[PDB]
């Protein structure tokens, strides 16, 4: 176990940076996710013989959709792997292993829609998981993926510590559900307020690995004006799918979803880092102050969709 992963020198640099692309060589994506994981955690974390056996299987279980697709996962992965090399040692070992694992595998299996397209469809996925739809899915994804033979990654822990990671990833995943993290950053904004936040507090600790979660799950909008504005055209590639799928159903979809009111994406997306995105970055940096150049690049960025909209682009 001597054989480190190297990147060029370029990616070696960027890679550290919360902005980085990682670029459109697919076959590239399993060597900086492992590269990330031998600096994240060790290079003794994972068995790399299970460790690429993982990522591949992990890989093909992804579906070539627009947004929802491998490359989500490795740029949701760098992400937290950017925030945990900027917070060193607030981190247990077991976390660092799990939240990477937790980020590659957030969207296993995701068709493209949302849970209400699910509800509204009837899809059989929707009677197993009446709440976090996709989210238990994926979770159900990863736990199958770990038990193939040959694929368990962390067959060397002891029976607790594995219990403690299957959970951190559990609730991990849970946590992109977007629905639930609204109530989730409120609750994180008052004990932050109040002074009440502990970190020595599981269900604190909780709280505050589901909003990291979300601010990787959402990085696209941290990234530079152009790597964020070509994301929007996949997202919205799904967003107007879905929409088609609602109008076959026989509902007018929200104009989110519509890709008749393409005129409206703009407005859409000052609603978005104002309700979102925002929000999500600022009580993100005030407990993790070295996470504050996602904030900043999500400002510039707000700052650009103003100027989409005053017509200057
Ligand atoms: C009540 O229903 C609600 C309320 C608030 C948000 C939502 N959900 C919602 O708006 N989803 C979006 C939209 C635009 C987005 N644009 C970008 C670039 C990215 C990365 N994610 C997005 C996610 C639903
Ligand atoms: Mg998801
Ligand atoms: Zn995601």
Known sequence: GLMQFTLPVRLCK????????????ENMWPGIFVYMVHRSCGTSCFEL???????????????????????????????????????????????????????????????????????????????????????????????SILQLEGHNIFSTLSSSEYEQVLEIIRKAIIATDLALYFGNRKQLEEMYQTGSLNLNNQSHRDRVIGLMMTACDLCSVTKLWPVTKLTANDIYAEFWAEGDEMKKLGIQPIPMMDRDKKDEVPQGQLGFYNAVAIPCYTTLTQILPPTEPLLKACRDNLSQWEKVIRGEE
Not at 84 to 107: V, Y
Request: aromatic share 14%.
């Open 49 to 143: 013989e299970k460790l690429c056996r993982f990522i591949m299987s992990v890989k093909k279980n992804y579906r070539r959709v627009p947004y929802h697709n491998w490359k989500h996962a490795v740029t949701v992965a760098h992400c937290m792997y950017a925030i945990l090399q900027n917070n060193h040692t607030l981190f247990t070992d077991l976390e660092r292993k799990g939240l990477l694992i937790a980020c590659l595998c957030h969207d296993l299996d995701h068709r493209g829609f949302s849970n209400s397209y699910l509800q509204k469809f009837d899809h059989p996925l929707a009677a197993l998981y009446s709440t976090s739809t996709m989210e238990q899915h994926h979770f159900s994804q990863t736990v």
């Open 14 to 25: 960027e890679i550290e940076l919360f902005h980085f692309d990682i670029g459109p060589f």
